[PDB]
């Protein structure tokens, strides 16, 4: 299964110029485009190698759409001020995420469109792609306007059509990276904390996609509740990192095993500290 997701952020900044509009696009865990209204010459720009082959009609077209969206979102920030009776002096944020999920055969699984105003749910397109769930009185005003203007049908047309079509195209063009899991490189480090205790840290580096499981066992007993597990983090080269650590009594180190589960690994992986 695969996904395409776009994330738009619009942020007002009174006495600091017009609102900033930033948009990013992902296929699965890979960012492929960006637009930033604060760039020197604002344009949709490539962020993955497999999108670079797109020609001028693509980039000019996306740039045109981004500029128009920035203007619309700037107006939407103004409308929100009215709905919520807010002052022109405060900074506010609209966030929108939308896109489509497809199955292994390329058929649409689900469409998405949901948003937040100042970090709180605002309005979301329901799974039926025909109705809206509105979080508050303001979003209810929007819901009615959108029912009147047949917005759901237009969005449905995108999600079922163009969204799926281009996702399939991106998946084929970037198949060597997007459809080839990168297994983690793994190792265990050992760090004495005192003469009586030591940290064992199990590393997973350079993996893709981001989903992974990293656990410690003592004598084959799971130690999840005594494990420090850091949030999965970007390496900076389109792959990910994670580690899991336990503090163990000195002398118990060889009883501890680290277990790694990842799509890029054929079978569950088990490691120990090798002195």
């Amino acid at each position: 299964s695969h996904s395409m997701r776009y994330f738009y952020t619009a942020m007002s900044r009174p006495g600091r110029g017009e609102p900033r509009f930033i948009a990013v696009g992902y296929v699965d865990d890979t960012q492929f485009v960006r637009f930033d209204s604060d760039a020197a010459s604002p344009r949709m720009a490539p962020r993955a190698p497999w999108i670079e082959q797109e020609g001028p009609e693509y980039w000019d077209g996306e740039t045109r759409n981004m500029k128009a969206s920035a203007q619309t979102y700037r107006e939407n920030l103004r409308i929100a001020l009215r709905y919520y009776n807010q002052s022109e002096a405060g900074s506010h944020i609209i966030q929108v995420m939308y896109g489509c999920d497809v199955g292994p055969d390329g058929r649409l699984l689900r469409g998405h469109d949901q948003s937040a105003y100042d970090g709180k749910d605002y309005i979301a397109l329901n799974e039926d792609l025909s109705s809206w769930t509105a979080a508050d009185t303001a979003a209810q005003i929007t819901q009615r306007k959108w029912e009147a203007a047949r917005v759901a049908e237009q969005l449905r047309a995108y999600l079922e059509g163009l969204c799926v079509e281009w996702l399939r195209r991106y998946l084929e063009n970037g198949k060597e990276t997007l459809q080839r899991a990168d297994p983690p490189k793994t190792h265990v480090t050992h760090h004495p904390i005192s003469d009586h205790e030591a940290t064992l840290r199990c590393w997973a580096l350079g993996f893709y996609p981001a989903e992974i499981t990293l656990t410690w066992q003592r004598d084959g007993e799971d130690q999840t509740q005594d494990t420090e597990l850091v949030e999965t983090r970007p390496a900076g080269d389109r792959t990910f990192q994670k580690w899991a650590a336990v503090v163990v009594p000195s002398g118990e180190e060889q009883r501890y095993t680290c277990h790694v589960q990842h799509e890029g690994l054929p079978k569950p992986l088990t490691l120990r500290w090798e002195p």
Binding site: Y6, A23, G25, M44, Y58, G61, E62, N65, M66, A68, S69, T72, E75, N76, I79, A80, Y83, Y98, I123, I141, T142, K145, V151, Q154, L155, Y158, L162, C163, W166
Partner: peptide
Amino acid sequence: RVAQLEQVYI
């Protein structure tokens, strides 16, 4: 490619 909806005001 991004959605191409015309002037979607809230």
